[PDB]
Amino acid sequence: GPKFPRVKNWELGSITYDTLCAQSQQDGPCTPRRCLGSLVLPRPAEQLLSQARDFINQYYSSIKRSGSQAHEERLQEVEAEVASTGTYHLRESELVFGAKQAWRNAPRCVGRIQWGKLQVFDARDCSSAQEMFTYICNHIKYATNRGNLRSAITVFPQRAPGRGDFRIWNSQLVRYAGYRQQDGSVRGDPANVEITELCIQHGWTPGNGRFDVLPLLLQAPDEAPELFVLPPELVLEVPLEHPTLEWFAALGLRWYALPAVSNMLLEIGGLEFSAAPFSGWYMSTEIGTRNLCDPHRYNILEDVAVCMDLDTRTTSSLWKDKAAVEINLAVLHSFQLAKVTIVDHHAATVSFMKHLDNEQKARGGCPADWAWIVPPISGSLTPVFHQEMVNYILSPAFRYQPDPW
Amino acid sequence: KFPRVKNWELGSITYDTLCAQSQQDGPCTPRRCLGSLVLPRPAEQLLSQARDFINQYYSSIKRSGSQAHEERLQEVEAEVASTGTYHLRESELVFGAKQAWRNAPRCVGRIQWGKLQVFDARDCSSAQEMFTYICNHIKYATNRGNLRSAITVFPQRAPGRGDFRIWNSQLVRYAGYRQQDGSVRGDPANVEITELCIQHGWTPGNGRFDVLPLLLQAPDEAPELFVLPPELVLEVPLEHPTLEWFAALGLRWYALPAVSNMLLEIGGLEFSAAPFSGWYMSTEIGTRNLCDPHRYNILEDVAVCMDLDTRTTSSLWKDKAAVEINLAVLHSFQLAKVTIVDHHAATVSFMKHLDNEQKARGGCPADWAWIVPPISGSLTPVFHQEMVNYILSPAFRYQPDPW
Ligand code: HEM
Ligand code: HEM
Ligand SMILES: Cc1cc(N)nc(C[C@@H]2CNC[C@@H]2OCCNCC(F)(F)c2cccc(F)c2)c1
Ligand SMILES: Cc1cc(N)nc(C[C@@H]2CNC[C@@H]2OCCNCC(F)(F)c2cccc(F)c2)c1
Ligand SMILES: C[C@H](O)[C@H](O)[C@H]1CNc2nc(N)[nH]c(=O)c2N1
Ligand SMILES: C[C@H](O)[C@H](O)[C@H]1CNc2nc(N)[nH]c(=O)c2N1
Ligand SMILES: [Zn+2]
Incomplete structure (x- = not known):
């Protein structure tokens, strides 16, 4: 073998070398002096252009058109645009490709064998918080399909210079209320105390149950967030x-x-979509x-x-x-x-083993966060426990972002 | 420079400053984390590992900078300068072994680190003598069920010659016997060692739980075979x-x-056979x-x-x-x-150990994938505890099978 990570499965005795990691353009938190791989959170002009260039190359490779007329014209088209506005815009199929690629690239998702099947809803025309509500409700209707769930992501408008963000404040589209008590105890879900309190401050009349569905705090650029209540028939x-x-x-x-995760940033070729909720099962x-x-x-x-x-x-x-x-x-x-x-x-873990095998043949590697892939019960009873993995950041990416308040 | 370590069950936060004393590099870089990989893949060097350890010793008995410190430091210069190496005093080895356990990132049992019977076997010269020593370690450590952590430290490595080694990975293991039907009877992990035993002339049982013999290797000698008296093996x-x-x-x-295939490093010296056992x-x-x-x-x-x-x-x-x-x-x-x-x-006591270490040292190197147990992970408080992992010396290192 060569100077790429050697990767062993200890159950089967099989070896692979990760060559995909060479592709990584962004440093993680580890150094040779210390491994920080178990931290949940760690931490213009040329910089933008190069990232954009890298993504367009990626797009063109995937459609097998690297080096070609349209590939080079699109590059020249992207440069042109960044030259006169400082940003640029994805094409429909470029967005679809990227979104899917971000899911493929997410080291913490055990469900990536499904990466290639994903309904990308383009909501980059959305202009109001009200319209977000609509968009979000269509997503929930589509994705829920009366219980026959379908992976989807709705993409709202990208970050702009000196212009506010589109943000969903809720960490997920559907979450339960948590109400702080006289006792100090929490009635409901203790994770959600803060957002619950934020909703009541923004005019929500709260329930008093262990399982009350939260309303949505949605924020169009430069306005404060408006409150929207999901019709109960919509929430299965x-x-x-x-x-x-x-x-x-x-x-x-x-x-x-x-x-339905709703508070993550989707970064594609330097462009940042601050509001782009995705959902699976x-x-x-x-x-x-x-x-x-x-x-x-x-x-x-x-x-x-x-x-x-x-x-x-x-x-x-x-x-x-x-x-x-x-x-x-x-x-x-x-x-x-x-x-x-x-x-x-x-x-699930069986199928991620299969995903690992596929990605080995296709890209020569699969970034994966072991502590996250291995399930919280019955660890070594699942095949992933015995699988060494390499963690590294690839792009397109889903990126965590701080609460907007 | 100093990493923030949060615990997500309670929301408490520490900073690890201990990791700055790490002198030996791990497998991660900023480009990619390899923390789930089980394995890695001259006088100035040794002399400075040795000073740094003697410092760690006198400091630990509070005598840092006194006479006995200064003259012992000099005893070290003098020995390396003339012989290319040096030797440790019994008390020093005792301090270093405990520190090696303490420093072991993959050990969930480190609450116990200071309680360790150290048996000095550096006056060992034959595989016969090795066996007696190992037999005493077992009687001590077992104590009719009341397990007592122990270690036995065979003679160090030496540029002149081959290593003292215990070929077995543990002192007590069950044999694995390859059947005709391409099936394994007994313990499939011990197929290769069982085939080595038989090759050095052991008569095998054919049960599912046959305690293997010991294959013990003195320098540059063919390893020798020793059967464990069945009464020693509880x-x-x-x-x-x-x-x-x-x-x-x-x-x-x-x-x-009782692990027997791991190399113990203290102050730059290497102990290639130093079995240890807890419970x-x-x-x-x-x-x-x-x-x-x-x-x-x-x-x-x-x-x-x-x-x-x-x-x-x-x-x-x-x-x-x-x-x-x-x-x-x-x-x-x-x-x-x-x-x-x-x-x-165990995980509850490991949390407390993390606390004591925090007060005493400014952190604790820990390997999350090994500390979290293989069932009910998130059911244990370790699951929700962020952990920094890095190599401190004295340490246990993994080593190549002698064959
Ligand atoms: C298709 C069915 C899916 C299953 C069964 C699945 C499974 C999982 C699981 C168990 C986790 C660990 C999360 C945790 O414990 O908090 C995870 C994480 C993640 N998944 Fe999925 N996933 C699926 C679909 C998706 C989809 C559609 C996307 C987006 C396109 C996605 C992107 C991610 C990301 C970015 C993470 C890391 C989340 C974070 O850091 O907060 N997954 N997945
Ligand atoms: C007091 C009872 C002890 C308990 C309950 C305990 C617990 C454990 C466990 C569960 C592991 C991981 C085992 C695995 O899954 O392979 C481990 C690893 C380890 N422990 Fe302990 N331990 C104890 C005592 C000791 C002692 C006495 C020493 C030596 C002084 C020690 C040094 C180590 C080392 C060096 C490892 C790394 C294992 C490897 O690399 O294969 N531990 N401990
Ligand atoms: C603080 C913080 C940082 C970060 N990066 N991430 C988090 C999400 C936390 C992690 N652990 C629980 C909670 O996240 C809850 C959501 N996790 C994923 C899921 F359940 F929503 C999901 C499942 C299947 C498919 C899918 F699309 C989404 C929190
Ligand atoms: C190939 C390889 C590399 C490595 N670093 N390590 C190994 C030991 C393996 C790991 N996983 C099981 C087996 O090691 C055998 C068991 N390890 C720890 C223990 F069981 F021996 C133990 C428990 C309590 C107290 C105590 F003193 C010792 C193999
Ligand atoms: C500290 C540790 O990294 C943290 O508790 C992680 C461990 N692994 C996880 N894995 C998944 N899938 N989700 C999680 O929230 C966590 N929590
Ligand atoms: C590949 C993976 O790192 C390997 O299976 C590790 C995971 N965690 C472990 N944890 C402990 N305590 N012991 C082990 O042998 C392992 N094996
Ligand atoms: Zn790492």
Whole structure:
């Protein structure tokens, strides 16, 4: 082998070299002195043009037209535009290509075997917060497809010089309210306290439940954000029940069908889309393990263990483990019952192995964040645990961005 | 320069300043992270690693800058200047071994770092003598079930000649025997070492749990074969709290986790045979050893016994059976009165260790993928704790198989 990362699968004994990483144009947070790979957050003119050039090259390569008349004219067209305005504009098919490429390039998504199937909705004509609401509601209608979920992304207008951003304030399109109490405890989802408080300040009359759907705070450039309420018929939800444990349904737990991230930046060839929400379908463990068992979230492990009649007095009864399995199973069982798309952590990780194999043949590598790809239960029971991965930033990219308040 | 380390369960924040004392480079660059890779791939150098360690020593017994410090530093110059190398005093080696454990980023058990019986075997000259030493280490460390962490330090490396080595990866391992049907009986990880044993003339059992012999190598000698007296090797029959059938699986594990193939570096000196042992954390046996597909791979057998649905993965039979096997192990070890710690207790103590280290040193090098357990990851507080990883010395390094 050569001076590219050597990558081993310890279950199978198979070796690959990552040559794609050579493509990376942006430094991550690690150095030879220290690995910072487990931090969740780390941290004009020529600079723009070069990025733009790189993306157009990428576009043209993908349509197999590298070096050609139209390829070189488009380059000259992009330069022209940046020369007289300082920015430029993607073509319809260039946006489609990029959006998909950003999903392909996201090191933290286990669901990338699906990268090539993605409805790109162009909303770069959107002009008001009201119009955003509309656009967002069409997205939710399309993507939900009555439970037969379909991956999509709606792209609003790119950042402009000295001009405000289009922003969705909500971290996801569909999230539950969290209400701070007299006790100090939270009723609802403790992640969402702040945004809940922001909505009430902007005129929302709040509910008082564990599962109230948040309204949307949407922001057209240079105005303050307007508040929009999703019609309940538009938000599909799955009441939670267990297959064998009959009491589970009595807990009154539930989750929403559509996982739609809404607070991420989509950066394509230097252009920045501050508002471009995307959505797919859940992996069982996101709801069952993270949302419902995290001590700083709904934290239902104790409750369920008690119902199950486990010894919660001692760690070694593996009461946390026993309960978490049933919650997870209750998630899957119930989504399946309601005929709403879900994938379990086994099935998912199997298919990402397949994605890894594809991307090896196609690009010679696949950036991947191990701690994020490996599921929060039953880790080494899934094939990804035994797979070494290389993490690196590629572009187009989805980039986290700070809350707008 | 100083990285911010947040914990997302509680929202608390620290800064790691400890990582600045790292002198040895890891595998990451700013262009790409390789932190999930299991493996990497003259007087000035040695003399400055040695001073820096002696500094670490006198500083640790508060005598930094005193007479005994100055003259010991000079004893080091003098020895390297004349011989190309030098030797450590017993107390120094004791300090360095504990520090090597402390510095081990992949060890979730570091709360215990200061409690370590150090056996000095540097006066070892034969594979015979090696064996006795190893046999004493086992008797000490096992202590009829009341496990005591220990290390034994064989003679250092030397430019003149070959290394003292223990060919085995652990002092106690189960043999893996390749069958005709291209199948493995026993432990598939130990196929190659089992074939080495047999080649150096061992008579093999044909059970699923046959304790391998030791292959011990003195400098520039053919390794020698030594059978462990069966009474030294404490084993644990596996049974289940509620499932009476489990015991009839005939499953079992050994008490003592004792790594023997890792090189111990202190002050630039290299100890190529320095086995060490503590006690197990249950997921090691229950999850990895027994349910890994390239190991004993018993998940399906056990789930079928549990009468679950193998046909589809959304019934979570892998997870369900995985838990019972971990349960069986805990129960069994607690029943046989043998130290073991579950992943919840251990990760809780690791958090506290992170706290103590923060106050004492300004951080703790940690490797997230190894600290987080292989089941119920996010169920443990380590999952939500950011972690910085970097190499401090004294350290344990991984080493090439001697063959
Ligand atoms: C198609 C079904 C999909 C599944 C099953 C899936 C699965 C996942 C999972 C389990 C995570 C870990 C997130 C967490 O625990 O917070 C993740 C992250 C991510 N996914 Fe997906 N994903 C899917 C589709 C998509 C789509 C359509 C996009 C956008 C085109 C996308 C882009 C991302 C990004 C950017 C992350 C990192 C998120 C962050 O850093 O906050 N994924 N995915
Ligand atoms: C006191 C009981 C101990 C517990 C519960 C414990 C726990 C663990 C665990 C779970 C691992 C990862 C194991 C794996 O999945 O391969 C590990 C790794 C390690 N531990 Fe410990 N440990 C203990 C004692 C020790 C001792 C006594 C030493 C030596 C002084 C030590 C030094 C190391 C080193 C160097 C590694 C890296 C493993 C490797 O690179 O293969 N630990 N520890
Ligand atoms: C603080 C911070 C930084 C960052 N980069 N990222 C986050 C999202 C956090 C991470 N962990 C939980 C939460 O993110 C919740 C959303 N995660 C992904 C998902 F569930 F919404 C999803 C699932 C399938 C498909 C899809 F398109 C989206 C937070
Ligand atoms: C190839 C390779 C590289 C490397 N760095 N390391 C290895 C040891 C492997 C890793 N994964 C399992 C196996 O190592 C055997 C077990 N490792 C730790 C332990 F079990 F030995 C242990 C537990 C508690 C206390 C204690 F002292 C020791 C292999
Ligand atoms: C500190 C650690 O990186 C953090 O808890 C991460 C670990 N892995 C994760 N993996 C996924 N998919 N989602 C997460 O939120 C996290 N949290
Ligand atoms: C490829 C991956 O890094 C490898 O499987 C690691 C992951 N985490 C681990 N963690 C521990 N404690 N022990 C291990 O052997 C491993 N294996
Ligand atoms: Zn790294």
